[PDB]
Protein: De novo design helix
Amino acid sequence: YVYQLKDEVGELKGEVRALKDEVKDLK
Amino acid sequence: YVYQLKDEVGELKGEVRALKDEVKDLK
Amino acid sequence: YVYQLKDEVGELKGEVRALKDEVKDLK
Structure:
């Protein structure tokens, strides 16, 4: 329940860093 | 405090899946 | 461990609101 969200927040976190990166190129 | 972040991580999580999707079309 | 993810979920959360915003202009 805490670990679950733990590693989870670790993936949306990466996923997001990516989005910021690729979209930023798109501009 | 844990539930709060719980359903919260459930929305940024979806929101993100969307962004990945729409932006990916943008490329 | 809970606080850590706490403020963390607070940043991906903002970061994401931004992405939704800027990408949405991109369309």
